[PDB]
Design a protein around this ligand. Structure first.
Ligand SMILES: O=C(O)[C@H]1O[C@@H](O)[C@H](O)[C@@H](O)[C@H]1O
Ligand SMILES: [Cl-]
Length: 300
């Protein structure tokens, strides 16, 4: 029986996508393949789950490409701030040749990409004050995901970054040891972060695709007919998740606003973009070979 990893609560678009995937595989194989999605990160933190999947210990999962930068260096390109112009542009690129290049990089590291799930855009939330300019982040203690790029992002605005597993964030914000974090509206809402960090500032500074994927070890052990069933089910589940995502993004925004969060938009987006130049400079100085791939995205 397969085991699938999900970081999210059961009632979440990713979760429904993954369950639909597993249901379809079982249906189309006539019960020959069965499995279960394990929600709420119970089978590990995200970096550790990625390692399990590469090793064949975990059969499938939906992973943010954010933490995937350590195992699969090519994927760092999607974690660059403002690298995508919009979420629809992200779909176009990830479903096209740039996404195919990332798929090849993942395969080289033992991971078979079946589709790219939507995670919208990430924005800052905190318990201290609204963020309207990069200067507002100065001195702020901000949790980030496990990718060094994100540490650089926060430091470039004078903040103090702490890499921390997603499941630990709520308590750290609640008890006041980090001031805030950054995420899309469904994540901010579903985790109850919005109950303990009541300022949400729509910087939309990262758009990070997620990948429904399989362990290559598991995938390579399937019959050709099973492989085709898996690929089709993956595509169908991606279509479903993306549809659910749109609906949930609005629903979560409504919950956030009805819950008393002070939401502010960013008038001067240019200032945040300019503040991020050093993240690009640094990444490409440490990793010159990635220059062509980065331009494939940022110049699209
Ligand atoms: O901030 C985080 O750790 C989380 O952010 C969410 O937007 C993403 O869907 C999760 O996979 C995880 O990356
Ligand atoms: Cl995590």
């Amino acid at each position: 029986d397969w085991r699938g990893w999900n970081i999210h609560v059961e009632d979440y678009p990713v979760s429904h996508g993954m369950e639909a995937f597993m249901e379809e595989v079982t249906e189309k194989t006539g019960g020959e393949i069965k499995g279960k999605v394990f929600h709420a990160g119970v089978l590990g933190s995200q970096p550790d789950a990625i390692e399990q999947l590469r090793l064949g210990i975990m059969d499938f999962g939906v992973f943010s490409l954010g933490p995937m930068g350590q195992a699969v260096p090519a994927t760092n390109v999607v974690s660059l701030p403002f690298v995508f112009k919009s979420v629809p542009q992200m779909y176009e690129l990830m479903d096209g040749e740039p996404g195919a290049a990332l798929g090849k990089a993942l395969e080289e590291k033992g991971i078979v990409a079946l589709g790219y799930y939507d995670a919208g855009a990430r924005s800052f939330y905190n318990s201290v004050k609204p963020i309207n300019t990069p200067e507002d982040v100065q001195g702020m203690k901000v949790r980030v995901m496990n990718n060094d790029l994100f540490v650089g992002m926060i430091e470039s605005m004078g903040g103090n970054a702490t890499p921390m597993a997603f499941a630990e964030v709520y308590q750290s914000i609640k008890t006041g040891v980090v001031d805030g974090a950054e995420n899309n509206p469904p994540s901010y809402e579903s985790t109850s972060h919005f109950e303990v960090a009541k300022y949400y500032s729509l910087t939309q500074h990262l758009i990070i695709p997620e990948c429904l994927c399989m362990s290559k070890k598991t995938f390579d052990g399937l019959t050709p007919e099973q492989q085709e069933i898996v690929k089709t089910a993956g595509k169908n589940s991606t279509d479903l998740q993306r549809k659910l995502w749109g609906e949930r993004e609005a629903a979560s925004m409504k919950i956030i606003m009805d819950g008393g969060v002070e939401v502010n938009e960013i008038a001067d987006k240019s200032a945040f973009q300019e503040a991020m130049v050093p993240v690009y400079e640094k990444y490409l100085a440490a990793n010159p070979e990635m220059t062509d791939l980065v331009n494939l995205f940022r110049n699209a």
